[PDB]
């Protein structure tokens, strides 16, 4: 009932802030698509600017989530800074093309693995790619990817949350909505909901390696992190 509406409201916040793979004009390039360097500066350039836009899109996604804007601004920032990397990893991995072994950005930009490495994923490249392959069997659509993101995001246990109790209240209908949604679409398979939940753990394992890449990276880039991206890690 009220469940259906939540699913559809979360599906829309995801559809609208994150176009599907096939809605997109793909287009590659031949920059260091061959050899693994430490960093290609032209790759880094497009990628970093793209990422400022993702992060905006991810904030937009959050604001459209039931009840999220009722949290204190300070909570809203706390939750965001905490989950935002995770979300962007999920998001980009939803854009993987197994055949080409590629990933497509929201403007069409389509990078193979070596190129992904060279734009700054470096050590994380393989983990991201493995995760993306492990998603395929799950066959997730927009409502599932949206819900799963909302659940990573709306986490009662963040450090320094001013209203942990209220965050927890928010996250409960999300969990349920996903449970029932996944059951509908996949009755044959009952531990698919938990299988999905546990994907947040792989996101964590990868995003946690985040700050240490930020350091070794700050080194081989010319200027410094675009301001907004600075705000999300730092």
């Amino acid at each position: 009932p009220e469940v259906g509406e939540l699913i559809e409201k979360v599906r829309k916040a995801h559809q609208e802030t994150f176009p599907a793979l096939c809605q997109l004009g793909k287009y590659t390039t031949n920059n260091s698509s061959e050899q693994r360097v430490s960093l290609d500066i032209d790759l880094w350039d497009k990628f970093s600017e793209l990422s400022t836009k993702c992060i905006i899109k991810t904030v937009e996604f959050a604001k459209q989530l039931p009840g999220f804007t009722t949290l204190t601004i300070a909570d809203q920032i706390t939750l965001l800074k905490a989950a935002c990397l995770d979300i962007l990893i999920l998001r980009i991995c939803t854009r993987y093309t197994p055949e080409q072994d590629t990933m497509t950005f929201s403007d069409g930009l389509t990078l193979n693995r070596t190129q992904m490495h060279n734009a700054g994923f470096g050590p994380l490249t393989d983990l991201v790619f493995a995760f993306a392959n492990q998603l395929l069997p799950l066959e997730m659509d927009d409502a599932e990817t949206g819900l799963l993101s909302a659940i990573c995001l709306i986490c009662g246990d963040r450090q320094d949350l001013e209203q942990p109790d209220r965050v927890d209240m928010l996250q409960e209908p999300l969990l349920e909505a996903l449970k029932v949604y996944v059951r509908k679409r996949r009755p044959s398979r009952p531990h698919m909901f938990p299988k999905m939940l546990m994907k947040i753990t792989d996101l964590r394992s990868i995003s946690a390696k985040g700050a240490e890449r930020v350091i070794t990276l700050k080194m081989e880039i010319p200027g410094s992190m675009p301001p907004l991206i600075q705000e999300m890690l730092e």
């Binding site: 905006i56 904030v59 604001k63 601004i73 809203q76 920032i77 965001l80 800074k81 301001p227 907004l228 705000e231 999300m232």
Partner: peptide, 10 residues
């Protein structure tokens, strides 16, 4: 009065 905050109040 921070990128994030402007993003969040607009």
């Amino acid at each position: 009065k921070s990128l994030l905050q402007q993003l969040l109040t607009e």
